[PDB]
Design a protein around this ligand. Structure first.
Ligand SMILES: [Mg+2]
Ligand SMILES: [Mg+2]
Ligand SMILES: [Mg+2]
Ligand SMILES: [Mg+2]
Ligand SMILES: [Mg+2]
Lengths: 204, 226, 196, 212, 222, 233, 195, 196, 195
């Protein structure tokens, strides 16, 4: 009944030293029924990464919408959109549906190509920006993720240390949530290389 | 949320806490609640956070165009009139509760505005879940002809009352001082009385702790030449 | 809220408390409920603060545009504009407004516009939650063609009792005097009116 | 939640998952969903945890009083009916129970009774109860035979819970196995679903849809 | 309509060691967005080397603890001053709770102590009396924040030995009382940061064969 | 299950170095009607305890009679009724707390919030709260209803934790209580200017002050406030 | 309507759909074909609210046929499934949404691959080796999870499908009057007339 | 309903209108709302007519049995019996009763028992739907130790206004005077009090 | 439970009762016997709310068996049906009524006549040549109205019953997993083990 917890799923993003990480589970369900273990919730438009939790039809719709908009942006601006600018675009786009919203919990992650500064941001379903320095969490196990991140996180982690932190944050949060899990992906993002890692986890 | 506004000798000061919550969970521990409508007109918002931000940016945008059109610096009464007529039209569905303060060629001003579109004038005001704690402090220590230093002290004390006593409020105190014939000075994290103590343990993992199935390079670059 | 307007020999006086509540919390204890829609046409507001402010602002706009074209409007005309807004939008408004004004031809006039959007011209009018407690007192003590000082005492004593019994009313008693001499604001503090 | 029990040549296999949830929140992964009523009788836990725990250890007390008075092991029929008659008295009050009362006596042989909080009492060969019951039924129905060995029957019960644990969001944690004989039940260990899934996937070749 | 229930917030945490047990809880008591008390003890020594906390609706919590303490007293009277073992206490509490099955104590109860072999024991109850012996259990407001962290740091879940890449699990080595107290303090520090109902103070009761000891720590008061 | 009819608003209280202070206004409201203006809501029990009650007044009067009966009953066959076996604040509270929780458990509550303020035999300060749900708690400052939201923040600035109590004199504590009562009169629409204040001190005993008034009020600034935005006149 | 199953094997997609149409109290028909051919190598089965199912299916069919004529080209199964998803995603925020769940089984002639897409009435699309809608998955997925192989022949897929239908007929309370089975491969769409 | 009781120098006087309504229909325009529970202890009834009659009858029975055993009851005792019934049965009663009596030791006394079943001893009390409109008037005009003639005028004028504004009140104004001299009934008709 | 049918022919009463027991989503059993022998020549089938059906049936059985032992005599089908009706008529104004509908098929050894009684949970009793409870009558009564004769043999009754069950299996949405058929005549009660 609650649109934000029909399909389930989680996204978490973290900042490190000259790097950001964004991670998500792979589950899509119809309440109790597991439907897909390959439903990735992280997308990218150039070097800007967007994770989206919540109602799966809206996740798909918004990805297509932001691909649409960032493609036109690039053709007109003659450059790839930056994380700070894209964050405002997500906020604008969500709030235009103020009284008929997309039931989603978006998370932006990326590195500004000009300043080199790591950037993360979160949103409620209606566009309010949470621009945290440390970490952003979203999804049906957001409480669990908040608990994991708050204790596990420390600032200025190196890319390969940040990977372990965000992975353990996701995995242990997901294992305490019925509607999250069934696989997981972690993106480690540096200024001009991005590594994608699929994690091994329990399949119940 | 605890937000206050206090009039003084030659201007007005607004202040706010820095906790934003979803239910009982703290989403952001250092939220910026002091929004700029124009260089010398600032407001603070309680209620639906997206609505307070959105309504501020919209009126701020229209205020800027109005300023350019009229070749005059924006007035607080214009911001107030535009905010209230917008909010009234939506009959409280835009959940923006604001304290609007600023200086303009007419003088210094302090107003509160409520989601349904009603407005109020005052020398001291408080809004949000910690407004009763804040108003207790304001009603105990406010006087006529406050100095700039006294008003900043009173405002931040009122926010502290919210921080310590209201569960909806916490973390830091932000302040903005708008004085007549001066630049508005935004004092982000004016007080920081809630720094987390060092943890008992480091939770940095050994590398290779997490089990990995696959690795791959993600192509973020555009289609290459040659 | 406790509001009233009383005609007297030299014109009319509007009176009001200054308390605005959100449930049992006093959101503003120094409210100005006496609002100016024209130089010598004022009103007392009760009901939804958002509604009565929105209405009063529209009326002020209408009378300003009226004045630019046709000169000073009558108090009746102002009441008619209020009524038009209140009656046509009765489904979406909670507003109880008393309109008071001074002409030189008509002198002091009072019109009350209750919830439904009807208009009633009266020698004096009382409204707001606190008015219920002073229907007896006001009816017994009102006289026509009182002096300024008598009318101020009548309003002060009436609203004193309204404030005494109504929890939604309180603070200061504000008054606005409308005569040929001009517009005079009065204020009376708790220590004055509570001992009456 | 997924619980099953089935009769076969060698007695009864009882298999259950271990997960307890409160909404989407996984409260526990280590719940004991088999209630050891006594050394010869087992009950399964589904619906209300307290209702099943409380009334099935109460049942154990009634069974003990019966054999003290009658100097004879209580029948599975009699034991199950004590429970069903009790919960029927409470019908309407809001008890939540779905259980299999499992036993193996001389006069009856291996016997399973499905007992319900709305008063239902059904004797049968295969029962499966919980949010993941439909998944476990699929594996059971297509592989069940009366002439299963104790080893193969134990695996079938384990594999059926795994099927449910995989697909049903509210089932998982670990698998508890029991084998009920005439001389009493025998516990066959706790099996973590996480480890079991990968083990079964590799050895069996099943779950090709999942990347390992 | 009269609502006989309320929510006094609070978070509790029970951890069973090898030869000890700790039951911790924050000392903040709340209703809605107000603080009632910054120090209202929630974990109680009930005698016979048993500690107890009934978190949730404080009136039902106080009633249950009171009735259990009373049960310990009468157990001594009726059974020649025999020590009430933790397993016997746990079964007794089930009956106290289930006695109000159709008008429940709106609490999540945890007791801690030592079993009859001297090993650390923690029992966890739902509002209507279903219970289980557990190694690790957080209860109350911030339970969902704390448990995943405990799964990871106490039971070493999802942690594998470097170099093996998922093939060998991190071995479950026993934790000392000093190690457990560090994890308890970090659990409550983290919960205080992200949960509005958690804060003010942390009181920990430690149970060993020598008896019950108390430790208090300040938490953030915002 | 009922609904409160005639009601009393905030009761506020705090501990200080040698005892406790408790205060409550003298109003019995009937919804928004300020019906009864001479209602005593602080009820002394002996010379060591004052029970402050908010909420339903008919239930308050019932509780008042229970306490009166408690004193009578304690004196029965008790040669030390005015000495070692006199009623303690802790006895009085525990009795009330038992009654409140029993009544809510029968789904027929006494619709009140109660603060028992007093000084024990050994000189210890007693201050504890109980309400219609049977919920109890103690704190250096305690307040009911609106007092909880407005008085507590002010009183906690004086005594913020246990260690502040010995540093707080009766003059500072009473000053803080009296200011809080003024703030409540400004901001609570169901409050009155007239109130009672009781001090229970381990040295000077019970001092019960009736017919106190909120004074030193700031209203003058109201004269400059005009309109609700754009109005100048 | 009720049960619709899909399974993608080595070289084909197999869609099984129940034959029963029930108007509350009575079974009005026991030979209903809950499927539409969208293009020569793309088949869509459907289940949901009465009227809306056929209306939606025929509306999609008309649009894909229109595209085929305009461009003289058959859209890929992926492209067709994306078009269908958008229509349902548009529909869910309409005045009266289409209450229709679909399976799209297609053979991609360019990639020489069978493809199965599952889309519910919200516009939730997933590509799967096997899928279902409603309660069908609850009974059949444990069997499919066990036996399914990506290199299965069409005949093996049909045998696994028979086992699924048998389990449905055993444990489902409703009589769905058997299933019509259709195969989508490189040669197009054909119906298995004995099942 | 408009009811009141006022203590004065020589004792106490109870006052009441005579209108009982069923919705907007006046079921009885000559009701006696001043009821005798003892020789010089009377009461004014408001709320459910069935409830207040049932209560008053039980009280009269209690005070009759009291008198047979212990002699004349005090007005306080009568009020306590009323309160006991009203408080203990608050869930099932809609009764607002004013109790007035004359002792020789205590003289005139007035107790009001509102909906909840609380007791309040007052110099004078007003109750019923019509009382809301005369809180201001009564508070301004009441004095302690008035004469019989002044108290009759005070009650007559007060209830006149209550009747004027409250549709649920009307008919005749009944009064009962309780003094050492005895019990005196008074009645005042519309043509008398409407011109006040 | 679901379908219970009864038909009184020349010399016997035939009761047909479905075998399915459905717990909402799943069919838990397909061999359930919804009947109790009250006395050697009296059989009662039943359907209604879970738990209450069997509880009521066994309670009646215990009472009739008690009467049989006390008096060393078998009550007539009419007497048994009157006892059962009173129990249900008493039950309908209880705190929690038995939600149970029954058919009582008996052979009266005194009158040498078969007798069929239909009683619903309200205590509404009727003696009939053929009867049913729930929706069973909606599908079967038109067939019974057409073919029934009071002089039918047991074999003809079974053939007419087969036609009724076939119509039920065709037009009913629910799968009731066939029926158990029992015959009550002068020699007592026996079950037709192939139907
Ligand atoms: Mg999970
Ligand atoms: Mg699972
Ligand atoms: Mg409106
Ligand atoms: Mg007032
Ligand atoms: Mg906190």
């Amino acid at each position: 009944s609650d649109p934000s917890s029909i399909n389930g799923g989680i996204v978490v993003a973290m900042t490190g030293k000259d790097c950001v990480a964004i991670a998500c589970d792979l589950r899509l369900g119809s309440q109790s029924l597991g439907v897909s273990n390959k439903f990735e919730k992280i997308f990218h438009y150039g070097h800007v990464f967007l994770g989206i939790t919540g109602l799966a039809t809206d996740v798909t719709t918004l990805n297509e919408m932001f691909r649409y908009k960032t493609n036109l942006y690039k053709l007109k601006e003659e450059r790839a959109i930056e994380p700070e600018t894209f964050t405002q675009l997500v906020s604008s786009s969500l709030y235009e549906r103020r009284f008929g919203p997309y039931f989603v919990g978006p998370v932006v992650a990326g590195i500004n190509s000009k300043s080199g500064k790591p950037f993360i941001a979160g949103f409620d379903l209606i566009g309010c920006i949470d621009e945290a320095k440390d970490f952003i969490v979203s999804g049906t196990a957001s409480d669990q993720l908040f608990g994991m991140c708050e204790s596990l996180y420390e600032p200025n982690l190196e890319p390969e240390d940040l990977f372990e932190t965000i992975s353990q944050a996701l995995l242990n949060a997901a294992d305490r949530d019925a509607l999250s899990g069934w696989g997981a992906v972690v993106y480690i993002i540096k200024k001009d290389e991005v590594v994608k890692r699929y994690l091994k986890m329990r399949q119940d | 949320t605890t937000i206050v506004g206090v009039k003084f000798n030659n201007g007005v000061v607004i202040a706010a806490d820095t906790r934003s919550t979803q239910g009982p969970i703290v989403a952001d521990k250092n939220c910026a609640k002091l929004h700029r409508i124009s260089p010398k007109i600032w407001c603070a918002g309680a209620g639906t956070a997206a609505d307070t931000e959105a309504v501020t940016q919209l009126i701020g945008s229209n205020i800027e165009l109005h300023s350019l059109y009229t070749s005059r610096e924006p007035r607080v009464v214009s911001a107030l009139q535009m905010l209230k007529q917008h909010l009234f039209k939506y009959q409280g569905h835009i959940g923006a509760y604001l304290i609007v303060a600023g200086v303009d060629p007419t003088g210094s001003h302090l107003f509160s505005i409520h989601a349904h579109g009603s407005t109020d004038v005052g020398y001291y005001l408080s809004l949000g879940s910690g407004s009763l704690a804040a108003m207790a402090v304001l009603e105990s220590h406010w006087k006529q002809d406050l100095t700039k230093e006294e008003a900043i002290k009173l405002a931040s004390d009122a926010i502290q009352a919210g921080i310590w006593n209201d569960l909806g409020s916490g973390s830091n105190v932000d302040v903005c001082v708008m004085e007549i014939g001066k630049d508005a000075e935004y004092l982000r994290n004016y007080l920081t009385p809630n720094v987390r103590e060092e943890k008992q343990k480091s939770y940095k993992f050994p590398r290779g702790t997490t089990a990995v199935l696959k690795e791959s390079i993600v192509n973020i670059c555009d289609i290459q030449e040659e | 809220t406790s509001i009233m307007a009383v005609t007297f020999k030299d014109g009319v006086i509007l009176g009001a408390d200054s308390r605005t509540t959100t449930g049992a919390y006093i959101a503003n204890r120094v409210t100005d409920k006496l609002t100016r829609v024209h130089d010598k046409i004022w009103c007392c507001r009760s009901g939804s603060a958002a509604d009565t402010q929105a209405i009063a602002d529209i009326v002020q706009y209408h009378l300003e545009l009226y004045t630019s074209q046709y000169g000073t409007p009558s108090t009746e005309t102002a009441a008619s504009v209020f009524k038009e807004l209140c009656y046509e939008n009765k489904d979406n408004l909670t507003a109880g407004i008393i309109v008071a004004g001074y002409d030189d031809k008509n002198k002091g006039e009072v019109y009350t516009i209750p919830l439904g959007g009807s208009v009633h011209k009266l020698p004096y009018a009382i409204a707001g939650s606190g008015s219920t407690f002073i229907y007896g007192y006001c009816d017994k003590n009102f006289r026509e063609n009182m002096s300024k000082e008598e009318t101020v005492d009548f309003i002060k004593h009436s609203l004193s009792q309204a404030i005494k019994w109504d929890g939604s009313s309180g603070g200061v008693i504000r008054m606005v005097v409308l005569t040929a001499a001009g517009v005079e604001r009065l204020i009376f503090y708790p220590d004055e009116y509570e001992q009456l | 939640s997924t619980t099953l029990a089935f009769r076969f040549q060698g007695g009864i296999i009882v298999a259950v998952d271990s997960r307890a949830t409160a909404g989407n929140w996984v409260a526990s992964q280590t719940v004991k969903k088999v209630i050891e009523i006594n050394p010869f009788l087992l009950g399964t836990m589904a619906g209300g945890a307290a209702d099943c725990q409380f009334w099935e250890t109460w049942l154990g007390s009634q069974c003990r009083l019966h054999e003290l008075r009658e100097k004879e092991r209580i029948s599975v029929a009699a034991a199950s009916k004590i429970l069903s008659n009790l919960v029927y008295q409470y019908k309407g009050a809001g008890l939540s129970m779905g259980t299999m009362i499992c036993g193996y006596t001389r006069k009856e042989g291996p016997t399973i009774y499905y007992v319900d909080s709305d008063g239902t009492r059904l004797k049968g060969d295969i029962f499966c109860v919980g949010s993941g019951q439909t998944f476990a039924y699929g594996v059971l129905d297509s592989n069940y035979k009366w002439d299963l060995s104790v080893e193969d029957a134990l695996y079938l019960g384990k594999r059926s819970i795994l099927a449910a644990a995989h697909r049903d969001a509210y089932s998982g944690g670990s698998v508890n196995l029991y084998h009920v004989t005439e001389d009493g039940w025998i516990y066959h260990g706790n099996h973590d679903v996480g480890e079991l899934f990968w083990k079964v996937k590799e050895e069996e070749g099943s779950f090709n849809n999942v990347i390992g | 309509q009269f609502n006989p229930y309320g929510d006094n917030g609070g978070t509790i945490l029970g951890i069973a060691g090898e030869d000890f047990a700790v039951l911790a809880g924050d000392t903040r008591n709340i209703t809605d967005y107000s603080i009632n008390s910054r120090y209202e003890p929630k974990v109680f020594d009930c005698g016979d080397n048993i500690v107890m906390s009934a978190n949730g609706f404080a009136a039902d919590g106080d009633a249950l603890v009171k009735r259990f303490k009373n049960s310990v007293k009468w157990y001594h009277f009726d059974h020649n001053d025999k020590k009430l073992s933790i397993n016997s206490a746990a079964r007794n509490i089930q009956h106290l709770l289930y006695g109000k099955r159709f008008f429940p104590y709106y609490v999540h109860t945890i007791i801690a102590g030592l079993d009859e072999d001297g090993k650390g024991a923690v029992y966890s109850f739902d509002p209507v009396g279903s219970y289980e012996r557990e190694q690790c259990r957080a209860g109350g407001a911030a339970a969902s924040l704390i448990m995943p962290f405990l799964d990871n740091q106490v039971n070493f879940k999802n942690q594998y030995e470097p170099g093996t890449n998922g093939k060998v699990k991190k071995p479950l080595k026993y934790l000392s009382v000093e190690e457990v107290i560090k994890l308890v303090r970090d659990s409550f520090t983290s919960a205080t940061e992200r949960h509005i109902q958690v804060g003010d103070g942390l009181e920990i009761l430690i149970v060993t064969k020598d008896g019950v000891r108390k430790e208090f720590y300040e938490l953030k008061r915002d | 299950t009922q609904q409160p009819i005639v009601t009393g608003t905030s009761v506020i209280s705090m501990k200080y170095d040698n005892g406790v202070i408790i205060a409550a206004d003298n109003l019995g409201s009937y919804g928004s009607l300020l019906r009864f203006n001479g209602v005593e809501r602080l009820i002394p029990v002996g010379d060591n305890t004052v029970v402050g009650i908010s909420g339903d007044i008919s239930d308050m009067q019932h509780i008042e009679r229970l306490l009166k009966d408690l004193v009578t009953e304690n004196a029965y066959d008790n040669p030390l009724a005015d000495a070692e076996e006199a009623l303690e604040p802790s006895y009085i509270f525990e009795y009330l707390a038992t009654v409140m929780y029993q009544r809510r458990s029968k789904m027929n509550p006494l619709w009140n919030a109660i603060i028992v303020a007093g000084v024990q035999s050994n000189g210890d300060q007693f201050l504890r709260y109980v309400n219609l749900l049977g919920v109890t708690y103690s704190s250096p400052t305690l307040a009911t209803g609106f007092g909880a939201h407005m008085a507590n923040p002010l009183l906690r600035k004086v005594v913020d934790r246990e260690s502040d109590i010995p540093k707080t004199t009766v003059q500072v504590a009473e000053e803080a209580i009296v200011n809080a009562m003024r703030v409540l009169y400004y901001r609570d629409a169901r409050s009155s200017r007239n109130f009672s204040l009781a001090i229970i001190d381990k040295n000077t005993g019970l001092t019960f002050k009736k017919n106190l008034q909120v004074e030193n009020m700031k209203w003058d600034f109201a004269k400059d406030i005009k309109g609700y935005g754009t109005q100048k006149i | 309507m009720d049960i619709i199953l899909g399974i993608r094997v080595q070289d084909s997609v197999i869609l099984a759909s129940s034959k029963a149409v029930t108007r509350g109290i009575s079974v009005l028909k026991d030979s209903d074909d809950k499927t539409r051919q969208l293009s020569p190598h793309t088949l869509m089965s459907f289940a949901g609210e009465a009227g809306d199912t056929v209306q939606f299916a025929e509306y999609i069919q008309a649009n894909i046929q229109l595209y085929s004529i305009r461009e003289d080209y058959e859209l890929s199964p992926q492209a067709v499934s994306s078009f269908v998803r958008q229509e349902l995603a548009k529909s869910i925020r309409s005045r009266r949404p289409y209450q229709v769940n679909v399976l799209i089984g297609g053979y991609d002639k360019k990639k020489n691959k069978p493809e199965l897409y599952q889309i519910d009435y919200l516009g939730t699309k997933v590509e799967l080796p096997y899928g279902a809608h409603g309660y069908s998955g609850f009974y059949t997925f444990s069997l499919l999870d066990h036996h399914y192989r990506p290199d299965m022949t069409t005949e093996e897929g049909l045998d696994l499908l028979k086992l699924c239908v048998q389990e449905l007929e055993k444990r489902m309370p409703m009589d769905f009057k058997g299933v019509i089975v259709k195969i989508v491969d490189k040669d197009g769409i054909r119906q298995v007339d004995d099942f």
